Design a protein around this ligand. Structure first.
Ligand code: SAH
Length: 226
């Protein structure tokens, strides 16, 4: 297979689409896969760096897809303003951190209907974004691959945000993580790392209080999904 496990997880969520845009597409293997399997009719394969975009175009050529996949050089979503970009069913953003991803989302556009994001940092700020704009978080899951964790979140802009509890905003809608031994294991390991820090910094530092509260928030959330 041409996709890593986490990229296949993104591809399962995409079907019967007219146009998708892969932000940070690198070598465009996800757009290529999606077009080859008739999940999308066309794809925009976008990158901020021209260098991997050159490899992407060659890849598109070697599979005979230049009429269906189009390389775009762009910082995030700046290109979507343009008049030749069609309405986009799904924008996918994979393999970036939440901070970078949230900044890209500042240029969210009415042409875009859904996001699938695969962040390599926890996505509390992306869930806050969805909630504060009243977008549905349609799907979340938690992925381990190549000695790294990944946070997958699907946002449907045409449906209302669920009324997430504050612990859910922090760690994920219970719906998607109930009984999830992988994620619970990760969160217990987060408590261990925080405990190490509590045995090193001064209890009068404000960080001690904040870290003590983080631990208790995690333990509460663990107890709910356990
Ligand atoms: N602000 C930005 N806008 C568009 N692309 C960006 C970007 N910042 C980083 N990138 C690109 O995003 C890619 C991250 S590597 C991710 C590759 C692939 N999408 C995957 O998930 O496996 C790099 O190619 C980098 O050039």
């Amino acid at each position: 297979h041409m996709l890593s496990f986490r990229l296949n997880q993104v591809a399962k969520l995409i079907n019967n689409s007219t146009a998708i845009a892969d932000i940070g597409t690198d070598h465009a293997y996800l757009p290529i896969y999606l077009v080859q399997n008739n999940k999308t009719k066309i794809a925009y394969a976008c990158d901020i760096n021209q260098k991997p975009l050159n490899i992407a175009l060659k890849n598109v050529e070697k599979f005979g897809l230049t009429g269906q996949i189009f390389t775009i050089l762009s910082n995030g979503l700046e290109f979507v303003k343009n008049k030749e970009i069609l309405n986009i069913d799904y924008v996918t953003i994979c393999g970036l951190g939440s901070q970078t991803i949230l900044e890209i989302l500042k240029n969210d556009h009415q042409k875009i209907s859904n996001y699938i994001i695969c962040s390599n940092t926890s996505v509390k700020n992306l869930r806050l974004w969805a909630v504060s704009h009243n977008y549905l978080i349609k799907y979340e899951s938690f992925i381990y691959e190549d000695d790294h964790y990944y946070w997958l979140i699907e946002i449907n802009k045409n449906k209302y945000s669920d009324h997430l509890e504050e612990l859910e905003i922090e760690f994920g809608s219970k719906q998607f993580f109930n009984k999830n031994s992988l994620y619970i294991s990760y969160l217990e390991n987060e408590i261990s790392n925080l405990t190490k820090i509590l045995n090193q910094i001064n209890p009068n530092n404000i960080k001690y209080l904040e870290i003590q509260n983080r631990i208790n928030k995690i333990r509460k959330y663990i107890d709910v999904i356990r």
